[PDB]
Design a protein around this nucleic acid. Sequence first.
RNA 1: ACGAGAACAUGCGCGACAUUCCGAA
Lengths: 123, 113, 307, 187
Amino acid sequence: NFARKVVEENKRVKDNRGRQEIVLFNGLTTSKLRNLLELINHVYTKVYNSDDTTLSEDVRDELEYLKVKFAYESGREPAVRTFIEKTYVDKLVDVVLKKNTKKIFLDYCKYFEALVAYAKFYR
Amino acid sequence: NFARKVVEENKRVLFNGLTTSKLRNLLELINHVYTKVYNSDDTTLSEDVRDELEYLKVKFAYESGREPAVRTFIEKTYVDKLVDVVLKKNTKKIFLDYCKYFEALVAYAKFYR
Amino acid sequence: EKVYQVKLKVYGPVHIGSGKIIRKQEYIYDRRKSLAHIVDGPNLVKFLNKKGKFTAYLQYLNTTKERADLYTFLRQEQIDTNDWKTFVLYTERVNQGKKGMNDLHLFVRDGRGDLYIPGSSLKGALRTVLEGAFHSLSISDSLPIDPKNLAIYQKIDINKELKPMPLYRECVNVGTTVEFTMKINSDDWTIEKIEKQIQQAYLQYWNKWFVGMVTTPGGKAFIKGGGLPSVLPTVLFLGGGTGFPSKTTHYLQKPKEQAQKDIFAILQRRFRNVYGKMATVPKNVPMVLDSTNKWYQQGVCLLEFQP
Amino acid sequence: YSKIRIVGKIDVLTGLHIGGGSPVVRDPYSRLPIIPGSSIKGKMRSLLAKHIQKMHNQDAPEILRLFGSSQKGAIQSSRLQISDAFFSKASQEEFDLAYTETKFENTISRLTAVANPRQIERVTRGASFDFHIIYNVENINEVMADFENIKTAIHLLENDYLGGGGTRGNGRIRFVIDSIDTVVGDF
RNA sequence: ACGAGAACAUGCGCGACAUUCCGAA
């Protein structure tokens, strides 16, 4: 997917005291992103269980909470804020809300999973 | 062939400690996409099959990130670049050839164990 | 098979980590009466959209990204408190030793919404206090605890003198009883033997470590405040923040005047920026240690068995 | 030869965990957690054998009579057929609250006291699975005794766990029998 | 006015029997 270039731009290398850490950002810890990852996990498991071609209203409410958590994480650490700025996750959640379809939400979830997978691979 | 050569080169423990349990997820995804292509009768890969191949590529990247043996397997066998080639050509024959290459790779890897 | 019903009495505040931490956004913190009402996100967002203030909440979060308190936002918007109690999950009491709510570690709770403590924590505590493959000794989880009892207790460090910390651990109010069912066989583990081992280990942990606190003025103040109940006798320290020495197999294995030195070395290894600078062995190793005037100790729990 | 059907409910009292290849076992069609019939049959067989060998086919004659035996020259058909327990629709509607929750265990080491956190996915307490069991009457005279053994096994399974690490508070279940009727035959 | 004419390689047969994705924290 096109997330390869985004992750490549977002990927940096850190060095300190003879130790070389291959991490994209200083604050890009697996748990800090994993909170929102598991929120999206709950969202898409609910979507899988519902098996409906339209994005559910309750999924929409958990999703609004997901946007709130996105702003929360951006405030928590500048690294997560810069990652979200580079990836423009807000625009993707906005399109997911607007077109209101299961396929679009699945594509966005796959793209976000691709982002995190490329981040892990480049680590 | 090429699979024999790469498996022999990575043989010493194969592919830095690769086993079938490490590859099982990629094998399942590959054979699922292969059966979906097999059921259809078309010379060109359909759009959903193309998206599934993109998902297979990202699964390759995820498995390379997870394990070092899988990572060196992917690097040495050019499987991701072969997936890109199949996507670019968009021919069912090329996809079947890639599936046969992967199957021969796994068969030889099991043979030298 | 020997089945025993186990009663846990939480004489002290106990906080088992749930693996997640929330800042002031997820709960409302009344500072005038010092009460924390835990809320969920979707209901808050739904109410905000109903009142047409969700964009205002987003802007407020943008301006106060580091410290966005839901109680202060609600006070600024001056919306009805009836709505506050309508969209909230559940209310809880706040106890501070000094301060606003900044970073709260939530207590472990089941999926439904009720709170409990896992049996794996009990298994680990029992194994680490016995030493000094546990397949026969099977422990289940606890019964749900009334949500109103649960509160947010302060974590206080006593380096020969009490000092509350800004960190908040969502502990359990005193006087709450929880229940367990545990199956053991008479072949491997004996109920009398294991309970005697627990009480003996707690006794020596008291006499070789806590006596040093007792001699220092901070421990004297803690005793005067009633931190240790008169019953303190099977005693456990299940929650987090109780401290490394509590139920330590290394303490038990090595003789006194030598086990303390090894514990000091271990603490230096674990805390390089705090204990690593320290090099001399003090009298007690380690040196670190409610709205009511009665004081309590972190994790203190009383054990009762009924076969 | 009569087939008697036992249909009822298994309600989890704790976190039910069956470690499907830490995820839990789910039915691919419905994406809901299930309790495999193999797990239940193995647990009951092990508990009953303990209550009553290297090959695992020796056991005691009642065990081979009930759960079957592949013994060379003494192949005994299994009178007990334990089917997969599927997530109850009533429990699913009650939860509609995620069906499964992740539990975090720090797993601290002894000597170095270094935590190695792990996550285990377990079905939330209060969930129910509809269970279905078939008993085949090979001999009319022994049936009573067989059912007695079955009851004992059930009791043991109620006092024990089912799947996952039950010594740490997983897999505890409760059995609610709805009906026991002779579906096939005249028994 | 063909070494030809008539002639089912076909009938019966469960890939099945025993097997906890579990111990450990």
